[PDB]
Design an enzyme around this catalytic site. Structure first.
Site, PDB file in Angstrom:
ATOM      1  CD  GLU A 131      -5.908   2.428  -6.520  1.00  0.00           C
ATOM      2  OE1 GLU A 131      -6.328   1.351  -6.017  1.00  0.00           O
ATOM      3  OE2 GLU A 131      -6.024   3.552  -5.943  1.00  0.00           O
ATOM      4  CB  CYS A 139      -0.910   0.032   1.245  1.00  0.00           C
ATOM      5  SG  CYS A 139      -1.918   1.554   1.336  1.00  0.00           S
ATOM      6  CD1 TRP A 182      -7.000   9.460  -1.737  1.00  0.00           C
ATOM      7  CD2 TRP A 182      -7.946   9.570   0.301  1.00  0.00           C
ATOM      8  NE1 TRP A 182      -6.060   9.958  -0.862  1.00  0.00           N
ATOM      9  CE2 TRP A 182      -6.612  10.039   0.389  1.00  0.00           C
ATOM     10  CE3 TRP A 182      -8.741   9.560   1.455  1.00  0.00           C
ATOM     11  CZ2 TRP A 182      -6.054  10.479   1.585  1.00  0.00           C
ATOM     12  CZ3 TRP A 182      -8.189   9.995   2.644  1.00  0.00           C
ATOM     13  CH2 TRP A 182      -6.853  10.464   2.697  1.00  0.00           C
ATOM     14  NE  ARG A 238       2.493   0.660   3.504  1.00  0.00           N
ATOM     15  CZ  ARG A 238       3.645   0.021   3.605  1.00  0.00           C
ATOM     16  NH1 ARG A 238       3.988  -0.477   4.789  1.00  0.00           N
ATOM     17  NH2 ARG A 238       4.443  -0.128   2.527  1.00  0.00           N
TER      18      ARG A 238
HETATM   19  C1  HEM Z   1      -6.338   6.687   1.987  1.00  0.00           C
HETATM   20  C2  HEM Z   1      -5.897   6.507   0.733  1.00  0.00           C
HETATM   21  C3  HEM Z   1      -5.264   5.202   0.201  1.00  0.00           C
HETATM   22  C4  HEM Z   1      -4.559   5.166  -0.930  1.00  0.00           C
HETATM   23  C5  HEM Z   1      -4.276   6.373  -1.869  1.00  0.00           C
HETATM   24  C6  HEM Z   1      -4.147   3.796  -1.152  1.00  0.00           C
HETATM   25  C7  HEM Z   1      -3.405   3.342  -2.213  1.00  0.00           C
HETATM   26  C8  HEM Z   1      -3.293   2.003  -2.541  1.00  0.00           C
HETATM   27  C9  HEM Z   1      -2.975   1.476  -3.851  1.00  0.00           C
HETATM   28  C10 HEM Z   1      -2.752   2.297  -5.144  1.00  0.00           C
HETATM   29  C11 HEM Z   1      -2.920   0.155  -3.758  1.00  0.00           C
HETATM   30  C12 HEM Z   1      -2.638  -0.808  -4.932  1.00  0.00           C
HETATM   31  C13 HEM Z   1      -4.033  -1.265  -5.407  1.00  0.00           C
HETATM   32  C14 HEM Z   1      -3.974  -2.233  -6.559  1.00  0.00           C
HETATM   33  O1  HEM Z   1      -3.090  -2.080  -7.450  1.00  0.00           O
HETATM   34  O2  HEM Z   1      -4.853  -3.153  -6.611  1.00  0.00           O
HETATM   35  C15 HEM Z   1      -3.176  -0.225  -2.385  1.00  0.00           C
HETATM   36  C16 HEM Z   1      -3.171  -1.505  -1.890  1.00  0.00           C
HETATM   37  C17 HEM Z   1      -3.533  -1.873  -0.603  1.00  0.00           C
HETATM   38  N1  HEM Z   1      -3.931  -1.017   0.422  1.00  0.00           N
HETATM   39 FE1  HEM Z   1      -4.092   1.034   0.233  1.00  0.00          FE
HETATM   40  N2  HEM Z   1      -4.511   3.026  -0.054  1.00  0.00           N
HETATM   41  C18 HEM Z   1      -5.297   3.847   0.763  1.00  0.00           C
HETATM   42  C19 HEM Z   1      -5.957   3.445   1.918  1.00  0.00           C
HETATM   43  C20 HEM Z   1      -5.914   2.177   2.494  1.00  0.00           C
HETATM   44  C21 HEM Z   1      -6.587   1.793   3.726  1.00  0.00           C
HETATM   45  C22 HEM Z   1      -7.526   2.743   4.512  1.00  0.00           C
HETATM   46  C23 HEM Z   1      -6.253   0.508   3.966  1.00  0.00           C
HETATM   47  C24 HEM Z   1      -6.697  -0.402   5.131  1.00  0.00           C
HETATM   48  C25 HEM Z   1      -7.165   0.122   6.271  1.00  0.00           C
HETATM   49  C26 HEM Z   1      -5.347   0.060   2.905  1.00  0.00           C
HETATM   50  C27 HEM Z   1      -4.738  -1.190   2.755  1.00  0.00           C
HETATM   51  C28 HEM Z   1      -4.245  -1.723   1.577  1.00  0.00           C
HETATM   52  C29 HEM Z   1      -3.965  -3.122   1.337  1.00  0.00           C
HETATM   53  C30 HEM Z   1      -4.099  -4.286   2.358  1.00  0.00           C
HETATM   54  C31 HEM Z   1      -3.480  -3.203  -0.090  1.00  0.00           C
HETATM   55  C32 HEM Z   1      -3.046  -4.468  -0.863  1.00  0.00           C
HETATM   56  C33 HEM Z   1      -4.322  -5.004  -1.494  1.00  0.00           C
HETATM   57  C34 HEM Z   1      -4.029  -6.247  -2.276  1.00  0.00           C
HETATM   58  O3  HEM Z   1      -3.001  -6.943  -1.997  1.00  0.00           O
HETATM   59  O4  HEM Z   1      -4.832  -6.517  -3.197  1.00  0.00           O
HETATM   60  N3  HEM Z   1      -5.142   1.112   2.063  1.00  0.00           N
HETATM   61  N4  HEM Z   1      -3.341   0.934  -1.644  1.00  0.00           N
HETATM   62  N1  XJH Z   2      -6.924   3.596  -3.407  1.00  0.00           N
HETATM   63  C1  XJH Z   2      -7.136   2.431  -2.756  1.00  0.00           C
HETATM   64  C2  XJH Z   2      -7.542   2.493  -1.421  1.00  0.00           C
HETATM   65  C3  XJH Z   2      -7.779   1.300  -0.737  1.00  0.00           C
HETATM   66  C4  XJH Z   2      -7.600   0.087  -1.384  1.00  0.00           C
HETATM   67  C5  XJH Z   2      -7.181   0.038  -2.713  1.00  0.00           C
HETATM   68  C6  XJH Z   2      -7.024  -1.334  -3.388  1.00  0.00           C
HETATM   69  C7  XJH Z   2      -7.779  -1.323  -4.715  1.00  0.00           C
HETATM   70  C8  XJH Z   2      -9.232  -0.885  -4.567  1.00  0.00           C
HETATM   71  N2  XJH Z   2      -9.852  -1.384  -5.773  1.00  0.00           N
HETATM   72  C9  XJH Z   2      -9.083  -2.437  -6.416  1.00  0.00           C
HETATM   73  C10 XJH Z   2      -7.787  -2.570  -5.623  1.00  0.00           C
HETATM   74  O1  XJH Z   2      -7.686  -3.885  -5.020  1.00  0.00           O
HETATM   75  C11 XJH Z   2      -7.590  -5.033  -5.819  1.00  0.00           C
HETATM   76  C12 XJH Z   2      -8.477  -5.214  -6.902  1.00  0.00           C
HETATM   77  C13 XJH Z   2      -8.423  -6.333  -7.729  1.00  0.00           C
HETATM   78  C14 XJH Z   2      -7.458  -7.310  -7.478  1.00  0.00           C
HETATM   79  C15 XJH Z   2      -6.552  -7.182  -6.410  1.00  0.00           C
HETATM   80  O2  XJH Z   2      -5.611  -8.188  -6.195  1.00  0.00           O
HETATM   81  C16 XJH Z   2      -5.910  -9.519  -6.466  1.00  0.00           C
HETATM   82  C17 XJH Z   2      -5.546 -10.105  -7.692  1.00  0.00           C
HETATM   83  C18 XJH Z   2      -5.856 -11.443  -7.967  1.00  0.00           C
HETATM   84  C19 XJH Z   2      -6.537 -12.215  -7.019  1.00  0.00           C
HETATM   85  C20 XJH Z   2      -6.908 -11.645  -5.795  1.00  0.00           C
HETATM   86  C21 XJH Z   2      -6.597 -10.303  -5.524  1.00  0.00           C
HETATM   87  C22 XJH Z   2      -6.624  -6.034  -5.582  1.00  0.00           C
HETATM   88  N3  XJH Z   2      -6.966   1.219  -3.377  1.00  0.00           N
END
Ligand code: HEM
Ligand code: XJH
Ligand code: HEM
Ligand code: XJH
Ligand code: H4B
Ligand code: H4B
Ligand code: ZN
Lengths: 411, 407
Positions: B283, B106, B278, B109
């Protein structure tokens, strides 16, 4: 064991068995991934196993594993090691070795080409003037008036580590950088330290923005000597844009021949500390990295100014807009002058086809995603979506310390 | 044991000690790096509980105090007795914020300590989950001024009474395969959309149909609910230069809200923990719009720009990509819906990494996910070495519930 990699765009799944032949270490462990870290005298004892493994690989490749010729060669190398502490590769083994080091280079997107490598054997070289001559011939052969051909030149191997052959240049052709008293840099900021060394050694610097650096060459552990590559052998391309007529007035150019000269080639435990190699450029190396890195030529502002983009907020994507225009210019310029170049779409698409073929014929293809994915437009190239496994096979290209940090000056 | 990371643009070196805490495994070994792979009893529970309370009590400067030992006693008593335990509200909030803090994929953070935690542990039914989720959606949306939030449903017990949101995100668009052979709407959601239909949903069969929620309480069969439209803030996509852009008929939603992950705190497992922040513009504009397996709109846009699509080397794909992404940011900003561009977000993450190194001894970061999917090397994170490791509390992937659920 079998390891699977998945392509998330196509759902194609591949099975890697080649990783079982890897012995060298990655930097990672069960508890930490070091996949984004840039940099994560042998005994007789350790040398014969390395020779044996290499020779078994060579003899398998020519369908002569376990033959009389294979057995006799193992015995001959064994004898030579105990008698002399080292051994000499046959010309055939040197060619196979250099090709396989390229094949095994996990950070190289251009590996579809690996089997077409011209190998120049320079193991009879003894002096820096001798190295200069070999290098000029390499440059002229590889350049081929713009129809670029991949090549490597291999100088004598390490003996006791006190007699190393080294090219001090990081690449055969590069531009000088000069730090000014006011703190600004003229030319390429990456080459400031090396330029200072050249000047100290007696190079008369022209002090311009694109001055081709002299070669600084070390033979047989002696102090290095300076030489100027003949300008007629250095092909350069002036950069212009197909639609923007002001682009030419930025005064940009680049050289056509990318030629890495600071790596070490390991084949069967032998160490070739001077092994310059060259291919042809992928456009982003110049248009993204050389031109647009903050710590390199850094031209994004001047280009965006000239395009009249909204520069007050990052969110207009002015930098992204200028970046694409510069990269179009680089490809246009090279193609117009008939100098070999490949765009990042073509090169990544070819790499995926290479990788799939390698999995089928070889059981795998070690690849470092961090380096293979291009530095712009990452996810609209097929490599972004391709899972990869990174591991180390020999023969290999390795990093080595810069020679100015280790050299014993004879005076 | 002490590890260094260098930034190759600025020469700043930071030292990482925080990795020594790490407990879970990476998938890598000494012989192979798996950095680019997407998915690599009572007795077990007390070390996990202990490790957590220890860091909790340390964080409020009360390590080794009587309150600390007392709580450790109390939880030890409860596990010995009930086979599980219950977090204090204070511990739940701490755990959730830290699960975000520890999320190595993420980039956002820097915001980790400003997270609104909605405790839904008293929830018992799917209608109840729907209520909590609408309340989260409305709160987080805040009429365009988005606020980060997580809603936490009851924890795993025996594993047969699982709370789950079947949706991958709270708000997504449906996907339909046509006789045509093509795909209408979002191809990523084709399967889930079918599960909705087979469970009763009446699909409009359009390009941007907001999906219904499929909510599973207490291990029961999941149930369908439409989120009130006025709670779903959507943005029509237009371009500040190209008047034709609007006629592509593109829109996206304002709220990114992941709903399929598992929150682990002190060994306890929360299988339904939707969270939202947000968007970063890429994305939507790079991945959602331009992935070949997603809306895949590059061809149509390039055509309307009248670019030369004959050869890859004209960079027509790259030009269109930039314009699409300009339109995303412009549209969200014009309609006053919070969004961050990839330059701003990555600049913030570098600053956050520096804070974490200085105040915590490190920051786990996965370079492959942190570097934006366009213009990689013109963002500062490209030049930043990162160490990737797994710390708890954490967010974890879990199997899709339709492969697992016994009807
Ligand atoms: C507040 C603004 C936030 C921004 C701009 C942001 C940005 C992002 C972005 C760009 C990704 C990659 C998403 C993708 O390519 O699928 C991501 C992944 C992730 N974020 Fe954030 N994030 C935000 C808030 C949060 C919050 C509030 C949480 C949890 C409380 C969080 C937890 C995670 C997690 C666990 C992933 C990995 C998801 C996965 O493996 O699919 N984020 N974040
Ligand atoms: N800006 C933010 C804020 C909070 C969270 C995110 C995560 C953002 C919010 N929409 C989509 C993104 O998560 C995805 C979407 C699709 C697949 C993915 O990973 C995989 C891929 C394959 C299998 C299982 C999970 C993660 N983005
Ligand atoms: C034929 C055309 C070739 C193309 C288009 C190509 C492409 C590339 C690119 C884009 C990189 C990354 C460069 C960087 O970001 O610094 C690279 C790295 C590399 N390539 Fe190639 N390559 C080619 C030929 C070769 C040849 C002939 C060899 C050796 C025989 C080679 C071996 C390597 C090695 C060892 C690296 C890693 C360099 C490092 O770690 O700094 N490549 N290749
Ligand atoms: N298209 C091609 C063909 C052959 C080889 C290459 C490699 C390309 C061609 N110029 C340079 C580039 O590799 C570099 C660049 C900068 C530094 C460097 O050495 C390092 C790298 C990391 C750490 C320390 C030293 C290697 N590119
Ligand atoms: C820290 C990071 O590993 C470093 O910036 C890398 C990332 N990927 C790269 N990829 C290529 N091809 N060349 C590079 O110089 C780099 N730099
Ligand atoms: C195979 C590869 O790991 C995969 O395509 C990754 C690459 N980096 C990513 N980075 C982010 N932020 N999101 C992603 O979905 C992915 N996909
Ligand atoms: Zn790794």
């Amino acid at each position: 064991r079998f390891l699977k990699v998945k392509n998330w765009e196509t759902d194609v799944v591949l099975t890697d068995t080649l990783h079982l032949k890897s012995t060298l270490e990655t930097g990672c462990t069960e508890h930490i991934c070091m996949g984004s870290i840039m940099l994560p005298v042998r005994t007789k004892d350790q040398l014969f196993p390395l020779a044996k493994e290499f020779l078994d690989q060579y003899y398998s490749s020519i369908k002569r594993f376990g033959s009389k010729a294979h057995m006799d060669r193992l015995e001959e190398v064994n004898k030579e090691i105990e008698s002399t502490s080292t051994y000499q590769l046959k010309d055939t083994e040197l060619i196979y070795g250099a090709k396989h080091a390229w094949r095994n280079a996990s950070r190289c997107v251009g590996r579809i080409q690996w089997s077409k490598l011209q190998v120049f054997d320079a193991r009879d070289c003894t002096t820096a003037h001798g190295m200069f001559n070999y290098i000029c011939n390499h440059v002229k052969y590889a350049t081929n008036k713009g129809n670029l051909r991949s090549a490597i030149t291999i100088f004598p191997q390490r003996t006791d580590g006190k007699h190393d052959f080294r090219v001090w240049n990081s690449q055969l052709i590069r531009y000088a950088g000069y730090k000014q008293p006011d703190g600004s840099t003229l030319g390429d900021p990456a080459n400031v330290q090396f330029t200072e060394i050249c000047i100290q050694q007696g190079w008369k610097a022209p002090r311009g923005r694109f001055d081709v650096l002299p070669l600084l060459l070390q033979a047989n552990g002696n102090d290095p000597e300076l030489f100027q590559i003949p300008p007629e052998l250095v092909l350069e391309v002036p950069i212009r844009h197909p639609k923007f007529d002001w682009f030419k007035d930025l005064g940009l150019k680049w050289y056509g021949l990318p030629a890495v000269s600071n790596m070490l080639l390991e084949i069967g435990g032998l160490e070739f500390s001077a092994c310059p190699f060259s291919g042809w450029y992928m456009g982003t190396e110049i248009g993204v990295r050389d031109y647009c890195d903050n710590s390199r030529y850094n031209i994004l502002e001047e280009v965006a100014k000239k395009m009249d983009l909204d520069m007050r907020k990052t969110s207009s994507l002015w930098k992204d807009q200028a970046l694409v225009e510069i990269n179009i210019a680089v490809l246009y310029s090279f193609q117009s002058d008939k100098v070999t170049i490949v765009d990042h779409h073509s090169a990544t698409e070819s790499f995926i086809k290479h990788m799939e073929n390698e999995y089928r014929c070889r059981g795998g293809c070690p690849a470092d995603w961090v380096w293979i994915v291009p530095p712009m437009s990452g996810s609209i190239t097929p490599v972004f979506h391709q899972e990869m496994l990174n591991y180390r096979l020999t023969p290999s290209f390795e990093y080595q310390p810069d020679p100015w940090n280790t050299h014993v000056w004879k005076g």
